[PDB]
Design a protein around this nucleic acid. Structure first.
Lengths: 437, 65, 187, 84, 48, 176
RNA sequence: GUUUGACCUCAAAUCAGGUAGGAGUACCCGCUGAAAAGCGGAGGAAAAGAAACCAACCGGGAUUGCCUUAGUAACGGCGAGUGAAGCGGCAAAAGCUCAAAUUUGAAAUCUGGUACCUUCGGUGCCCGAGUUGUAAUUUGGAGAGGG
RNA sequence: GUUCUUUGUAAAGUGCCUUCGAAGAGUCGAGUUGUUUUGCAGCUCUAAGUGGGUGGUAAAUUCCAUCUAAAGCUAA
């Protein structure tokens, strides 16, 4: 069916029109009449099917049917493992709530605690959060309007369990009310301990719908962005997609490289989704273009057969990266050459690549061929306030992305020279970011 | 008694500042308060309360004779 | 007189008694040629006087008064930085490329954290001799601090070798004897 | 007569300590050195244990919980100096 | 004062801050090697 | 700014450097008079939080007192000496077995910087004559004991006040 | 360089401009104090005054004063007698300012002298004061940077 | 009320988003002495920063309440 066929409030209709959605994906078209019906649900769907919007529509329907004040309650609660997925879900949800009247917020470990605290003191009518920081905010923030719980959703309980936040989740649900609460949850696969949390969460009986060499380039953390720029100039007139972690670094690298006037398309959660669709369409039809994107915005959509996969940032799911390069090779008869940047702290990832048993190719670097624009970068950052702030934001979100990373054995912040990271961003002195180290 | 000073805390070096204070706008652009003082002098010269220095040297060159 | 008697009896009662090692880092200070070249550096970066400031203001204001709006272009002013809270403020970013520290301040406690603070912040501090010589290069009576951050490209190579010179001459020579209790020998 | 939840006003003193003020206090600690009863106190730990150390510190202080913090602080100093 | 005059094996420690926290006193008795500890709470300068 | 360093270093008084400076300065001030003019506050941060500004119309006296309170008497001495000045405030710096030392900020209501600059022009009012003589200073209000709290009851002067409450009888036109 | 100069300190001025004292003292505020006197300091009022408050409630909301609380609580050879306060009702109602992180792309601040002017001041110029911090902005009820 | 001028990328306010988000130490307090009926003063000692002050509360390895001291002004 269509989104515009179903019974909806008119600002939600304007929202769906402006997000470009008319049609429905089939599994979400299945789950939406139980989503309106008020039953609990679990669901198996691929990461990036639009399954955010699938719950976003009847959640805002519930908030519209209840019309309660921002002081009145919180209601819709969203639990999501990754800070990046949290920002993507939030950025999709912003315009949806913006045509609506209610309130939207963020709770993320790695954000400023007095910020999130003051937002909770004001009250937030739709919460999106990481599991670890929720125990802090429920146990510590006073006066926060918790007793309502109109609903609750979990996304990718595989990833919560694979991180290991499930005990935190049990403490949360033991804090959570149940009788007003309905629980909806999406997870592409399932295990037993997923189902144990599901048996606690799902208050009625639910009906549920279930439907090769790599490049690796070891570089120091300062010169890696420069080498990306050099390799991108050398491979100009070849379409290449670069995978990042943080949307701020996406926007900043895109604005930077457009200031260096080589044509670059950005693709991130802060990008408006109609503009996002325009950029993806222009990349797919232009066939010689630079695409900067995060990991999971790239996960959310199928990829044309590309000259290069370049992964600059650390991965969200390395297992999904191993499956993703295999499905990329088997899907694309045109050869797509995959590479990842490495830092000399990261070589244990390589042995996990040796756990993946796929072959590996080391791609070498000449120190003579260095683009040498870093002085121009620093003069630019000392010049432009706007570029200065976007550079600081990419740096900040980059470090918070490392903070939010699961594999500590692959990534330790203690290993990293933040001076070189700042010089890669172009700062001679690393700016202060309030990060537990 | 007396004994030499222990430098346990100095020997670890901070690679970052203390405060995450955002940089202000005015550190990057030409100074505003300068320009307000400029326009003050402009308003005084438009009222003629301040003589231009070229005109002042013109005055002194005639007044010396 | 009394005041001559006291100012001669001062610096006797100090050296007669054990000074703590966080003092007497002062007067373990910079030698002759290096302080000379440091002053040759900072006289290249004198700040603008009030007269020169007001003069340039009158020039540009007479320009706009004719109007005759000539252009909108000026790179930046570069100068030494000399306000004490401003000097500390330029640290903890860090922005201070070099800091000069006067040995003689009568409230010494205004100053005593600055060698350890630039030590932990890694800022190339140097203890200079005489706050009047700081005030001369900054158009004040005294200054007691002297920070310098922004340098033209003509002078940046001189800056780095001066930093290496100071870290050789100050940080290597006086670091262990900084820890020792000075004075204590009677007069 | 039913309910209404006020926004709880917590003083900014009661929030936390900053990185800046911890840096300030710890940087003052090594510069100031030890007071003479602290010079006594580290030695009295090293000689006759934290029992007699806490008792002497409480005698120097007025109360007991401050003597806890004082002894724990000098233990932090001993741990910062001796191992490192 | 009179009770401190009575039992010599009693002591006359300066007064504690908290009327509410009481476990610390055990430590205090451990630091004074006492086998029975006595605590006087004065609520509102009226109730003992 | 550097004032936080001065405050936190100031809280560690019996630390070696501060007692060194204290021991030098007590002898140095012992050379001078009972009352004299200091060029600058030796504890500038304490003077700031008591209200000092570095401009004309702010006079710092250093005063020596033998071991009312000692601090209030120290304020009364420089109040008697410089009558044209109005006493802003005072603070401890140093002490000996023989004498305690205080550093007192006084403000002149005659200087035009003080007569303008409306943060401080209130002290030009003749109701602010000799605040130390009436105990209107900070140490004066402490020794009078004027705050809010049940800990604060009828004390000395207020005691005579409530003795006054017992001493006078109130009668209406129509007797109640 | 045995010279010269910055400071810093301390003196001196028949230098310029100001200011303190004494009287009175009904009321006010401090200090001292017997069987009150005294001292010191002000004003038309003074003081106090914007909670490190009161409460335990369906909470209240700077200070001041009146009525009530109340001759109660409490204290006292629990003898002589001493002797409150919360709340309530009313009068009156008013709130503000510093001190903490940089303006560093320009001490932006002010006294004083002089020349004029529309003079409880204004403008200009010049000495000074001031970075050992004068301005703007911010006093938790936050606030700041940006957008 | 009339009348003359006042802008200079001048100053401010409201909502939303983002990034931050620093405060009164010879003080608090403790002991003693005097003084007062609990404060004040002297002498000695002398702190903390999710801190501190104060009060109820307990089904008890308690919970909750309520303010921000050690800076200042303010008519009636």
């Amino acid at each position: 069916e269509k989104f515009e066929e179903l019974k909806l409030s008119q600002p939600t209709l304007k929202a769906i029109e402006k997000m470009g959605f008319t049609t429905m994906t089939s599994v979400q078209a299945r789950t939406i009449p139980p989503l309106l019906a008020g039953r609990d649900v679990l669901g198996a769907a691929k990461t990036g099917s639009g399954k955010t919007l699938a719950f976003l529509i009847p959640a805002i329907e519930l908030l519209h049917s209840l019309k309660f004040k921002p002081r009145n309650g919180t209601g819709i609660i969203v639990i999501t493992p990754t800070r990046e997925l949290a920002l993507q879900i939030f950025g999709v949800a912003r315009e949806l709530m913006e045509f609506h009247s209610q309130t939207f917020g963020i709770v993320i470990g790695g954000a400023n605690r007095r910020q999130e605290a003051e937002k909770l003191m004001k009250g937030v009518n739709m919460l999106i959060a990481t599991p670890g920081r929720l125990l802090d905010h429920l146990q510590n923030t006073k006066g926060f309007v918790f007793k309502n719980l109109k609903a609750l959703i979990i996304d990718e309980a595989d990833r919560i369990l694979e991180i290991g936040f499930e005990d935190e989740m049990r403490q949360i649900i033991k804090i959570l009310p149940n009788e007003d609460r309905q629980s909806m949850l999406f997870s592409a696969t399932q295990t037993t301990k997923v189902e144990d949390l599901a048996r606690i969460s799902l208050r009625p009986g639910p009906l549920f719908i279930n439907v090769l060499e790599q490049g690796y380039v070891v570089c120091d953390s300062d010169k890696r962005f420069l080498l990306l720029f050099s390799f991108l100039k050398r491979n100009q007139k070849k379409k290449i997609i670069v995978f990042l972690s943080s949307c701020n670094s996406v926007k900043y690298y895109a604005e930077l490289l457009n200031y260096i006037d080589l044509p670059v398309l950005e693709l991130h959660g802060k990008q408006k989704q109609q503009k996002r669709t325009n950029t993806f369409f222009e990349f797919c039809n232009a066939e010689r273009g630079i695409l900067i994107c995060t990991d999971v915005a790239a996960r959310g959509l199928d990829i044309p057969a590309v000259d290069w996969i370049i992964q600059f940032d650390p991965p969200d799911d390395p297992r999904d990266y191993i499956h993703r390069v295999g499905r990329t090779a088997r899907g694309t008869k045109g050869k797509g050459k995959s590479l990842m940047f490495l830092t000399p702290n990261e070589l244990g990832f390589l042995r996990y690549l040796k756990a993946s048993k796929v072959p590996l190719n080391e791609y070498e670097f000449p120190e003579n061929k260095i683009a040498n624009v870093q002085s121009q970068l620093e003069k630019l950052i000392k010049s432009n306030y706007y570029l200065h702030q976007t550079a600081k934001d990419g740096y900040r979100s980059y470090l918070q992305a490392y903070a939010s990373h699961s594999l500590k054995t692959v990534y330790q912040i203690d290993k990293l020279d933040l001076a070189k990271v700042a010089k890669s961003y172009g700062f001679p002195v690393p700016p202060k970011v309030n990060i537990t180290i | 008694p007396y004994e030499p000073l222990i430098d346990w805390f100095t020997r670890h070096e901070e690679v970052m500042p203390l405060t995450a204070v955002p940089e202000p706008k005015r550190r990057f652009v030409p100074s505003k308060n300068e320009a307000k003082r400029v326009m003050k002098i402009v308003r005084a010269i438009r009222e003629g309360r301040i003589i231009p220095p070229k005109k002042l040297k013109e005055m002194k060159x005639x007044x010396x004779x | 007189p009394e005041y001559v008697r006291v100012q001669r009896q001062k610096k006797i009662l100090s050296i007669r008694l054990k000074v703590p090692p966080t003092i007497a880092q002062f007067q373990y200070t910079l030698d002759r040629n290096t302080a000379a070249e440091t002053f040759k550096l900072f006289n290249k970066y004198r700040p603008e006087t009030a007269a020169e400031k007001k003069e340039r203001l009158t020039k540009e204001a007479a320009a706009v008064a004719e109007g005759k709006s000539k252009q909108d272009a000026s790179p930046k002013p570069y100068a030494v930085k000399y306000g004490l809270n401003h000097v500390v403020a330029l640290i903890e970013n860090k922005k201070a490329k070099l800091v000069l520290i006067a040995n003689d301040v009568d409230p010494i406690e205004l100053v005593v954290f600055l060698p350890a603070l630039c030590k932990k912040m890694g800022v190339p501090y140097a203890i200079v001799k005489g706050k009047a010589r700081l005030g001369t290069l900054v158009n004040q009576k005294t200054s007691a601090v002297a920070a310098l951050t922004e340098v033209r490209a003509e002078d940046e190579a001189a800056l780095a070798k001066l930093v290496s010179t100071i870290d050789a001459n100050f940080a290597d020579k006086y670091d262990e004897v900084k820890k020792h209790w000075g004075g204590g020998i009677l007069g | 007569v039913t309910s209404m939840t006020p926004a709880p006003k917590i003083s900014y003193k009661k929030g936390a300590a900053s990185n800046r003020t911890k840096f300030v206090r710890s940087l003052v600690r090594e510069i100031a050195g030890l007071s003479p009863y602290e010079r006594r106190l580290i030695d009295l730990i090293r000689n006759s244990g934290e029992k007699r150390a806490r008792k002497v510190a409480k005698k120097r202080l007025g109360s007991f919980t401050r003597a806890k913090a004082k002894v724990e602080e000098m233990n932090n100093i001993i741990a910062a100096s001796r191992r490192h | 004062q009179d009770l401190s005059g009575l039992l010599p094996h009693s002591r006359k420690e300066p007064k504690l801050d908290t009327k509410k926290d009481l476990q610390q006193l055990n430590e205090i008795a451990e630091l004074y090697n006492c086998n029975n500890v006595l605590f006087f709470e004065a609520r509102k300068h009226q109730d003992l | 700014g550097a004032y936080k360093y001065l405050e936190e270093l100031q809280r560690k008084k019996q630390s070696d450097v501060l007692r060194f400076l204290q021991r030098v300065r007590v002898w140095e001030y012992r050379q001078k008079n009972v009352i004299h003019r200091a060029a600058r506050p030796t504890r500038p941060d304490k003077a700031r939080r008591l209200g000092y500004k570095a401009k004309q119309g702010f006079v710092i006296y250093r005063v020596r007192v033998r071991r009312r309170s000692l601090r209030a008497t120290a304020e009364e001495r420089v109040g008697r000496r410089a009558a044209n000045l109005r006493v802003l405030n005072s603070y401890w710096v140093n002490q000996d077995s023989t004498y305690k030392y205080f550093e007192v900020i006084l403000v002149d209501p005659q200087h035009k910087a003080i007569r303008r600059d409306a943060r401080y022009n209130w002290i030009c009012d003749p109701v602010h004559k000799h605040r130390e003589a009436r105990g209107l200073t900070a140490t004066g209000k402490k020794s009078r004991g004027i705050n809010k709290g049940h800990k604060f009851n009828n004390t000395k002067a207020g005691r005579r006040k409530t003795w006054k409450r017992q001493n006078t009888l109130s009668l209406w036109r129509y007797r109640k």
